[PDB]
Amino acid sequence: MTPAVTTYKLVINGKTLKGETTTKAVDAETAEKAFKQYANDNGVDGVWTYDDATKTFTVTE
Description:
Layout: E1 6-13, E2 18-25, H1 28-41, E3 47-51, E4 56-60
Parallel strand pairs: 1-4
Antiparallel strand pairs: 1-2, 3-4
PDB class: immunoglobulin binding protein
Keywords: immunoglobulin binding protein
Assembly: monomeric
């Protein structure tokens, strides 16, 4: 079988970057790593939340 993948969402409230993006991953920690890399790549340095009920991460600057 192929692994079950979940679509995770990132809500971004940055100084210059704002909106939402998504990633697919087998677990939340993998999605978190992808989103933290994306934020780093775009110069976003904020604080984060993760809601396991909605599979949504939020970062605010």
